Amino acid sequence: ELFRSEEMTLAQLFLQSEAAYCCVSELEELGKVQFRDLNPDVNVFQRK
Amino acid sequence: SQSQGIQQLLQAEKRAAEKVADARKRKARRLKQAKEEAQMEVEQYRREREQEFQSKQ
């Protein structure tokens, strides 16, 4: 039994935007999840 | 399953858009009907007041 990296799921989550604000806040406190940028070609004004 | 979730949400959004645009079309139609009926009621009022005039005369 050797130490290896943790399994990763490259997983996608859909939820309502009101729920999204709260969830991001709470998942953030969890500090165990890393979100990926789904709009790499979009600048901060475009992100809104 | 996300690609399927995406397809389902797009179908729901399609229906929602159709339902709202249809409501707007209905709104326009109801507005036209409202004007037609109003004019018919106005004529009814005209008839009645003309009859009242005749009675007074």
The DSSP result for A1-48, as a single string, is ----PPP---------HHHHHHHHHHHHHHT------S-TT--HHHH-
- Are A23 and A15 in contact by the 8 Å Cβ rule? The answer is yes
> Which positions in chain A touch B5 (Cβ < 8 Å)?
12, 14
Min Cα distance A12 → chain B (Å) is: 6
Interface contacts (A, B; CB < 8 Å)? 5
Q: Which amino acid belongs to residue A42? A: V
Resolution to 1 decimal, in Å? 3.9
- Please list, in sequence order, all residues whose beta carbon lies within 8 angstroms of the beta carbon of residue A39, skipping any fewer than 6 positions away: A46, A47
- Please list, in sequence order, all residues whose beta carbon lies within 8 angstroms of the beta carbon of residue A46, skipping any fewer than 6 positions away: A39
> Which positions in chain B touch A14 (Cβ < 8 Å)?
2, 5, 9
| CA nearest to B6 within chain A | A14
- Are A14 and B5 in contact by the 8 Å Cβ rule? The answer is yes
Q: Which amino acid belongs to residue A28? A: E
Task: Find where tokens 């709104």 sit.
Answer: B27
Contact residues, chain B to chain A, C-beta under 8 Å: 2, 5, 9
